[PDB]
Ligand binder design. Sequence first.
Ligand SMILES: [Zn+2]
Length: 323
Amino acid sequence: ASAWPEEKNYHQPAILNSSALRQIAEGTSISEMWQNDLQPLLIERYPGSPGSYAARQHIMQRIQRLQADWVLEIDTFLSQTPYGYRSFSNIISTLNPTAKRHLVLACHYDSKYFSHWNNRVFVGATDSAVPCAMMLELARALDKKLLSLKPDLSLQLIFFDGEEAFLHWSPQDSLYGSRHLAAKMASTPHPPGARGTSQLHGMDLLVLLDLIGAPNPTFPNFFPNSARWFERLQAIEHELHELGLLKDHSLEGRYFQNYSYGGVIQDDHIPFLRRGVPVLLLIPSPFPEVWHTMDDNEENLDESTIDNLNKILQVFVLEYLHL
Ligand SMILES: [Zn+2]
């Protein structure tokens, strides 16, 4: 019985030097992301809505235009909800589908349902349009390097549907897409033909982004089994900073601070965490001031903070995949 599922326990990053770091910082464009990946997603997109359909087409189209060999799958299912049975569709974008191991980045593309109020519409800018856009900008920025993948380890992106409760949170009303996908992955043999390993055993680490985009985010070190990766985020943030590659940034106001947070946060990582998947959680604590409010809009986003996190995330991914 091969011990490949244990390889993630010992995987070490291939650290980028200064020159490569400047290259990555210069390779990403916050303005390009803003216009081409984020704005099209700032629309009402709760499950089953026209906006949900449009967001999916946007996410799919932006990935399909890239050179790397992304395999796109739409995972569609029915679930009971407070409003009766409804259909949901997770979007999975995978490089090297038969690769045994994958580093996984994830977020949710649905927006929380609210009836229009005073002609205001909830578009969930930090929740989670920006994370969706950061993942698309990461695919774009690193396209040339990812193309070379065409450790038996690759990259996967998941855009969950139905993360949000239709009413207020309850065990049965929330995480529709991730509860569904986690059980499906746990019961799908991997790699193809495998006798006793599942897609879940194949997930090296789930990097989950949500509620990102507000000013001064502080991300705590949530879990001991991914602490050494949280430390790499800190090391990367620190070096990008020292090299003068971040904007409007200081170490005292650093994003990754090593304080723990013991409580549970309800988001898409939960169904995976509870089945044994190591999670690196990029959800700040406290949550943005505009959380679940009509003010979670474009106007309240912090552009240089998103740009800074894009650089950190991209360096982290390259170092993880040895690219
Ligand atoms: Zn939310």
